[PDB]
C-alpha cells in the first residue's frame, strides 16, 4: 500500500550548559533507520535498521556532513527566534522540524511535508501544494517573506518530488523483508472483577506492525465511544507495537460486549468475546 519517509529534528538550547543539543532520526513508515545525536562522543549518523547498513561510506559521510550543518543552522535559527519573539538569552527553547514524503502503491508521490515548530507550537509549514506557506503568527510571517524571496519552496518541492520518493523506493526494495511485511496483531480478551457489581474487559493487541490500528468495544453492537479506556499505541522495543482497550462492565452482562480489531495485517477485521 502506501509508504512514508520522515526525518525528524529537534534542537534545544541550554544556556550556560554549552551549545544547543541536536537530535535527528529517520523513519520509513514506523521503522527507525538512522540517528544522529550531537552529544555523542564522535557525532556521526548511525544506522538503526539492517537494510541501511549496505549503504557505502559516501552515503554516511554525506549524511553526517548534512546533520552537522543542520545542527549549525538550527543554532543560528534559535538565536533568530529569540529576536523575533523579543526573548531572553537566558532561557531554554526548542526548534523542531520534520520533512518527508508519502508514496502510494505505485511508488508515486502522494504527499510531501516540511513543517517547523518553536517551543512546541506550530511556526511555519509548507503547504500540500509544495509551493506556498502557512505562518502561524507575525514572527513566522517574517520567515515566510524571506523564504518566498529566496524561493525555498521550489527547492523543497524538487527534492520531495524527486530524491525523496526515489530513495524511499530504494529503501523499500532493500528492506522489503520487513518494510513490506505487515505483522497482524495477536489478540485476546482478559477479565478482571472490580467488585461484586462490575468487571473490566480488556482487549489486547500485541506484536503488530505497522502501528496504525483500530480497537473498539461494542455493547449490544453499539460503539462504546465515550466509555472506552484506550491506551496509546506503544512500542514493544522489538520493532512491533502494542495496545489495549477496556470497558467497565456490569457483572453478568459480559457476553453483550464485543471487541473489534482492524489492522492492515488482518485479512478481515476481528471480533472477540470474553470466553471462560
Amino acid at each position: 500500500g502506501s509508504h512514508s519517509m520522515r526525518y525528524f529534528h529537534t534542537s534545544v538550547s541550554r544556556p550556560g550548559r554549552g551549545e544547543p543539543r541536536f537530535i535527528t532520526v529517520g523513519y520509513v513508515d514506523d521503522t527507525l533507520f538512522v540517528r544522529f545525536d550531537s552529544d555523542a562522543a564522535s557525532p556521526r549518523e548511525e544506522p538503526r535498521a539492517p537494510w541501511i547498513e549496505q549503504e557505502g561510506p559516501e552515503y554516511w559521510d554525506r549524511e553526517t556532513q548534512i546533520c552537522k550543518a543542520k545542527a549549525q543552522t538550527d543554532r543560528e535559527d534559535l538565536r533568530t527566534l529569540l529576536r523575533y519573539y523579543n526573548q531572553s538569552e537566558a532561557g531554554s527553547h526548542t526548534l523542531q522540524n520534520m520533512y518527508g514524503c508519502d508514496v502510494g502503491p505505485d511508488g508515486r508521490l502522494l504527499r510531501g511535508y516540511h513543517q517547523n515548530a518553536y517551543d512546541g507550537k506550530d511556526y511555519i509549514a509548507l503547504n500540500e501544494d509544495l509551493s506556498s506557506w502557512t505562518a502561524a503568527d507575525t514572527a513566522a510571517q517574517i520567515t515566510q517573506r524571506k523564504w518566498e524571496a529566496a524561493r525555498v519552496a521550489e527547492q523543497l518541492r524538487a527534492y520531495l518530488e524527486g530524491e525523496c520518493v526515489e530513495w524511499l523506493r530504494r529503501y523499500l526494495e532493500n528492506g522489503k523483508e520487513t518494510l513490506q511485511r505487515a505483522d497482524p496483531p495477536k489478540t485476546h480478551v482478559t477479565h478482571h472483577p472490580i467488585s461484586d457489581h462490575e468487571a473490566t474487559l480488556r482487549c489486547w493487541a500485541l506484536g503488530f506492525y505497522p502501528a496504525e490500528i483500530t480497537l473498539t468495544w461494542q455493547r449490544d453492537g453499539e460503539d462504546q465511544t465515550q466509555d472506552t479506556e484506550l491506551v496509546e499505541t506503544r512500542p514493544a522495543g522489538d520493532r512491533t507495537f502494542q495496545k489495549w482497550a477496556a470497558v467497565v462492565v456490569p457483572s453478568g452482562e459480559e457476553q453483550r460486549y464485543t471487541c473489534h480489531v482492524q489492522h492492515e495485517g488482518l485479512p478481515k477485521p476481528l471480533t472477540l468475546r470474553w470466553e471462560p
Binding site: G26, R62, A69, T73, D77, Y123, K146, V152, Q155
Partner: peptide, 9 residues
C-alpha cells in the same frame, strides 16, 4: 537520504 540545501528562518 536527507535534503542537502541548508536554509535559515
Amino acid at each position: 537520504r536527507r535534503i542537502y540545501d541548508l536554509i535559515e528562518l
